[PDB]
C-alpha cells in the first residue's frame, strides 16, 4: 500500500495506480454516446438532475463550427481543458486562416495531460472527452483517458454502465455507414436506453444530441428540439 | 488526530491550528473597550512591575494616526509587526487620497492583512486580538475588533484577553441603554468593569480616554485613584 | 532608413437610417503613384447586423480585423450570445488605446442595428475616441462628401424644406451620386463601389462601377 | 525494497529498483521486432486489436522521427508520444544549426542521454518506453540501435522488444541476414511474428511492417504489403 | 459472506429513532423533533436516546411532569456540547 | 463461469469484461461475486442476469455503495 | 431460506450462510441479534 | 490517502473537497426562491451578543445594482469571492457598456475556486447564492467548493439545508407571485430555526425588473412578520 501515494512511484509489479484510479473517476460519471457514418458524426450524452426542481448538468458543450466535444469526470478538469481547447483553435485561424485538422488537435492534448502524469505537483486529469470533428477527410470519433491515450474508433460508449452499450454498438456498426440523421441519430439513442434501469425513460429534459455535418455547422439540440428526434420510437420489450 | 498543517481540513471541516492560535490570545492580560456620547475609553490591567525595569517600554497601548487608537492582546512579538506595518498603511492611504483614514479602513487592511497570512503553509499565522478604538470618521465614535482568523467585528463594548467571559458577561448587565452621558460616568463604568481584574489591587489599571478632538490623554495615577474613591463612595449604599 | 507607415487610399461611407444602415466604399487598393488592384473592398461582415468599415494602412486593417473577429468568439463562448452594436463599440475603444504610443493608422466606422432595431453609425479615430453620430464619411475623400450630405440628409442651411426621413430607394441614390463626383476630383477612389444594405432580415451586398481611370 | 521509493537513493548492495521496477514494464508490451539488411533496414510490430470498435491504423507504434529516422516503440504508449516529439524536436536544430540530416550514431546520444536524465532525480520517475531507431544513407549505410529505459543505446544487427524478446531472437539468429535484399526481409520478417503467439490466449492482432532502405532512395515509409498481401500469403504457410 | 456494516443516520434515520424513544414520555403535544435531529450531526442511537432521558431528569430537577422544547435543548448541550466543542461555541465568529 | 453453470445468465456478458475490473481477488471472492449477483436480480425480481447485475455484486464483495458525488456533472 | 426454501432453488441459486457485522459502537449491533431472537422460529445458540 | 488534493482514492475521488462541503454544514440557512416577478431572498442571522452590532454581520452583501448575494460556510474565504464578483462586473462595465448577465458572473467567479491546487493551496468553504434580474429575466444560481455550477429555481442551504428543501419541493410552482413566495419563505424559517422569529433574527432581500434597487427591507419586515 506504501506504493499506492505519488504519480512518481513506480510499483514491484510495473503498474503506477494513480493512472489506475484516475480511470475510476470517468466511470463516477453518466454514460454518453457517439458515432459516425460517411458523412455525418453525432454525439448523444445523458444528463444528470442535482436536485428535483434544479436544472440538470450540461454535458454537451461547443468548440469551434466544425468541432464539438462530450464530457464525463470531474468537472474541474472539463473547463480547465475547455479553455485550452479554444485557445488553439482560435490560434490556427488567427496565424493560418484555416480550421484545424482533428486528428492533430487530439495529439496536443496527449502532450498536454503526459505533463502531470510524471511530474510531481499535480494530479492527472480525471476526464472522458469525447470528440467529434471534420478535417479535410470526413467526420472523425475520438476518444481520450486519463492515462493521456487517445484513441479513434467509429463507435464509443464511456461512463457509467456504458458496456450495456458497447454491445449494442458491436452488432449494429455494419449499418453505420449507410443511414442518414432521421435514423443514425435513434440509432444512437437506442444504446443510450440500456444505460438506463429498466423502470424509467429517457424523456425530453435529461438528453442532449450534438450534430456536426459535412454541410453542417455543430449544433446543439437540448430540450425543445429533441421532440423532432424522440418522435418514431418503440419501447423497451418489458 | 490531524491538525499539523493550515491547509487541511478536518472530517467535520475545521481548521485547528487556525482554531489554536485563538487559544493563545487567551494567555494575555484583559483590556475593555466601551464607546460613548463623544468620549471613547479604553482600559487594560495587569501592569505587574518587577522592581528592576523601565515601564516606557512594556505599553500596550498605541495609536495609529492621530485619531485612532489601539489595544491588543496575545503575544507581544507579533503585534510589533503589525503595530508597524498599520503605521505605514494609515499614512500611505493619506498620500494616495488627500482624507484622513477612517476607522474601518484601517480595520480591513490589519484583517486582509492577517487573512492571507493564514492561506500559504509554511507562515505562522498572528496569534494577537485587537481592538481599534477612532471617533474620526466624521465625528461618529466607534470601536471594532479583529480575530486571529482574521474577521473584522464591530461591538458597542468589549472584552478579551484572559477572563474575559466574565467581563462580557458582566456589562450586558451593565451597558444602560441609557446613553452614559457626563463622560466621568462612562469612564467610571470602565473602572467597574475593570475592578471584576484578576486580582484588582487598584493600581494596576492603565485606562486611556479621547475626547474625539484633541489627542491621546494618558490617565495619571493620581485622578484614576480619584476615580477609584467615588466607585467606593457609590458601595456605602450597601448597608 | 525604415520608416513603418505608408498610406494606401480608400473612402468609406455610412448611413444610419430609420430601420437600416448603408456601408458603402470603394474597391481600389494603392501606394504612391501605382495601382496594387482594382478588386480590394473595405466591408467586413462583423455578425448579422454589424458591418465595419478600415481605411487606412492596410496592414493594420488585415490586422485589427482578425484581432476583432477572434475576440467575437470569446465573448460567445463566455457569455452564450453575440454582441450587440455598441458594445462592438466600446471594445474596439479599448483596444484602439492599448496601443496609445504606438498607434494603428486606421480609421474606422461602425454601422448596423441596435437592439430596438434603428440605424446607428459609430465613427472613430486612430487613437479610439467615438460618438453616434447620424452619417460620416471616412477616409481620403472625407472633405469632399461632408458638405454635401449636410444639404441632403441633415438638410442645413436650408430654408423652407420640410425635415422628411430619408427612405431606403432615395438612400440608395445619394450614395450612387456622390461617389461618381468624388472619383472624379480625388485619384484615390474609383474602379467600383460595394454597397452593403443592413436589415432585419439579412445583409444585401450591391456592386455598382466606376471610372477605371 | 523500502529503498526502492525515490530513484534518487542506492540499494544496500548499489542499485536502483525504480530503473528496475520501470525495465518489466515494457516487458508486459507486446512483441515489435527490428531487423537490417545489407541495403535497409525493416521493420516489424506485432499488434493486437482492443476489442472490435479500433478503426484499423489507430495509435500506431510505428513513429516516423525525421526523413530516414522511425522509432518502433514499445511499453507506455503514452510515454513513448512524448519521448517521440523529443527526437523531431532534437532533429530539427542539428537541421538548422548544421545544415544536413541528423547521423544516427549522433541522435541516439541526445536521446539517451535525455533519457538518462530522468533517472536522476526524486521529483520525475525513468520512462517506462523501449524502442528501435532505424536509418539508412549512402556515406553511412544502415544502422540500427535500442535503448532501454536506463539509457544504455548501441547497435545490433537484429532485436525483440516486448514478451517474446528471448523467444524471438532465437530464430533471428539462424539467419543470414548479412547478405540478403530487404525485399526478401519482408517475407521472413512476418513468419518470426506469426510463430510465437499471434492470437493464440489472445483474441486478434495486425500486422505492420515499416520499411527504410535503398529501394526507397533514403526515405522512411511503410510497406506496400497492402498490395498484393505477400506477408501473410507465405507467414501463413507455416502451420506444418 | 455477507459484510453488512452500520453507519450514522442521516436525518430521516434520527427524526424515526426521536419517535421511537420519545412516544412512551410525558411530553408537549406540539414540539418538532426535526429541529432536533439537526443538531446532533455525528451521533448513534445510544447517543439519541441518552438525550431522551436526560430531557426528563431536567424536568425532575424543575417541578413538572412533561416536558417542554427547552428541555430537550438543554440536553442536548448537556449531552453532546459539555463534550464534543468547548473552542467553538463561545469563539465562534468565523462561521455566521 | 465454473460457479455461474447452474443460473439463467442472458448470453451477454463477457467474463474477460469482468476480469478487467476484478482484480487481485482470491478464488473465494470469485465465487462470492457468482453467488450475490443471483440474489440482486432477485430484489427486483428479475428472471435472468446481466453484466450490471454482476458489477453490482463486484461492490457488494468489499461492501461498496455510490451516490451522486456532485463532482461528475 | 427458512420460510420459503423454494425461490433459490427453482431460479438455482444458494444463500450466503455467514453475516459479520461491524462498525461503530453503540450503533444497533446488539438490537439487530436481540430483534432477530424474537422472530425466529427456530433453533437458536447465544454462544458467550 | 486523505490530506491531500494531489491524490486520488481506490473509488474516485477527494476526500478533500467533500471535507470543504462538510463546512458549510456549520454555516447558517439561507433561502432563495426565483418568481417570474423577481426573486426574493431570506436569511437567518444567529446574533450572538446584544453589544454585538447586528449590522457588522452581512449576509445579503450587493455585488451589483441589479444582482443580490447570500453566503453560508467560512467567512473568511467569503470576503474574497464577493471582492472580485464586484470587481469582474465593473470590468465587463469598463470595456462593453452593459450589464454583466447573472450567470457570467459566476462563470469569473467559479474560474478562481478550481484554483486552489491547479497552478503551475486549500479549496474554499463557503457555498453562495446568487440572484439577480438580467436580460433574460430573474435569474437565480448556486455554486460550491468544486466549482460546480447549476441553475436553481429555489434554494435552501447552509445548516438546516436538507431539512428546508423537503418542506421547500412541496409549496413551490410555476405560477407563483413574488408577495406570496416572501411568506412562503420564512414559514419555512420558523420550522427550522429554534428561537422564535422576530425582527432581529432575519433579513429579506428582493429584486424585481423595473425596481433594480432596494436589495434589503428595512423594517417593512415588521409588518410580513406580525401577519404571518
Ligand atoms: N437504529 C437504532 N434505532 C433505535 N435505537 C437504537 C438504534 N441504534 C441504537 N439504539 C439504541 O442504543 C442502545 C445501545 O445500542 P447497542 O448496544 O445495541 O449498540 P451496539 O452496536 O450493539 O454496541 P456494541 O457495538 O458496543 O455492541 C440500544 O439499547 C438502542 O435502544
Ligand atoms: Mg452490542
Known sequence: ?238 | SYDRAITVFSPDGHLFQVEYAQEAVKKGSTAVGVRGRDIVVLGVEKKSVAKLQDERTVRKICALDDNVCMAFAGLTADARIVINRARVECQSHRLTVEDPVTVEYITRYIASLKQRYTQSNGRRPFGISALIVGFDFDGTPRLYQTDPSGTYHAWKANAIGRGAKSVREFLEKNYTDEAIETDDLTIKLVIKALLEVVQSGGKNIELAVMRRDQSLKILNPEEIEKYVAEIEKEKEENE | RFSPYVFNGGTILAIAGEDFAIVASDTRLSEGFSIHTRDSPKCYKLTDKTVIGCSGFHGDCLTLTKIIEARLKMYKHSNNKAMTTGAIAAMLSTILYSRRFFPYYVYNIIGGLDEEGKGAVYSFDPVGSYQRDSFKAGGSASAMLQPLLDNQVGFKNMQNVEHVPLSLDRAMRLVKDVFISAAERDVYTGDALRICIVTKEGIREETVSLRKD | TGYDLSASTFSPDGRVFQVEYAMKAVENSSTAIGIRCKDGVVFGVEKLVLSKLYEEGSNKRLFNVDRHVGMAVAGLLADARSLADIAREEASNFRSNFGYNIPLKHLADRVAMYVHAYTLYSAVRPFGCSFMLGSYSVNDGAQLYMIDPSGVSYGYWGCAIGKARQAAKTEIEKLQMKEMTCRDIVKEVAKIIYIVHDEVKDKAFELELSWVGELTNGRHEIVPKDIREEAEKYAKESLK | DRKIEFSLPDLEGRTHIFKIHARSMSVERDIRFELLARLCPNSTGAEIRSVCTEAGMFAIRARRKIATEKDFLEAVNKVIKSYAKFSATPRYMTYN | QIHSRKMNVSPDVNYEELARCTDDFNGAQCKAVCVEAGMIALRRGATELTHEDYMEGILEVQAKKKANLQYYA | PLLHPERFVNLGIEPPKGVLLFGPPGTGKTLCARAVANRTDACFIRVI | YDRGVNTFSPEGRLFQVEYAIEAIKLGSTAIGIQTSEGVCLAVEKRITSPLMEPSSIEKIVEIDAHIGCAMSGLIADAKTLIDKARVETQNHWFTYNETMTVESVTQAVSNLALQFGEEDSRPFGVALLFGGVDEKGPQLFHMDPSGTFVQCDARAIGSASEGAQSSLQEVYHKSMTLKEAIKSSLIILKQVMEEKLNATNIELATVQPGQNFHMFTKEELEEVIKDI
Not at chain 1, 66 to 81: E, P, V, Y
Not at chain 1, 109 to 124: A, L, N
Not at chain 1, 146 to 162: E, L, Q, V
Open chain 1, 1 to 238: 500500500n506504501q506504493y499506492d501515494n505519488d504519480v512518481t512511484v513506480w510499483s514491484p509489479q510495473g503498474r503506477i495506480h494513480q493512472i489506475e484510479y484516475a480511470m475510476e473517476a470517468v466511470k463516477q460519471g453518466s454514460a454518453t454516446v457517439g458515432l459516425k457514418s460517411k458523412t455525418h458524426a453525432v454525439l448523444v450524452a445523458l444528463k444528470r438532475a442535482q436536485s428535483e426542481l434544479a436544472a440538470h448538468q450540461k454535458k454537451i458543450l461547443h468548440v469551434d463550427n466544425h468541432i464539438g466535444i462530450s464530457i464525463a469526470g470531474l468537472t474541474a478538469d472539463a473547463r480547465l481543458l475547455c479553455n485550452f481547447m479554444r485557445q488553439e483553435c482560435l490560434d490556427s485561424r488567427f496565424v493560418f486562416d484555416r480550421p484545424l485538422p482533428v486528428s492533430r488537435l487530439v495529439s496536443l492534448i496527449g502532450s498536454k495531460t503526459q505533463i502531470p502524469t510524471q511530474r510531481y505537483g499535480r494530479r492527472p486529469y480525471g476526464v472522458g472527452l469525447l470528440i467529434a470533428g471534420y478535417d479535410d477527410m470526413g467526420p472523425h470519433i475520438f476518444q481520450t483517458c486519463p492515462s493521456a491515450n487517445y484513441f479513434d474508433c467509429r463507435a464509443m460508449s464511456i461512463g457509467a454502465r456504458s458496456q450495456s452499450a458497447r454491445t449494442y454498438l458491436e452488432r449494429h456498426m455494419s449499418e453505420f455507414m449507410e443511414c442518414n440523421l432521421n435514423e443514425l441519430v435513434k440509432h444512437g439513442l437506442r444504446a443510450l436506453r440500456e444505460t438506463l434501469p429498466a423502470e424509467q425513460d429517457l424523456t425530453t429534459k435529461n438528453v442532449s444530441i450534438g450534430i456536426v455535418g459535412k454541410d453542417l455547422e455543430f449544433t446543439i439540440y437540448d430540450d425543445d428540439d429533441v421532440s423532432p428526434f424522440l418522435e418514431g420510437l418503440e419501447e423497451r420489450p418489458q
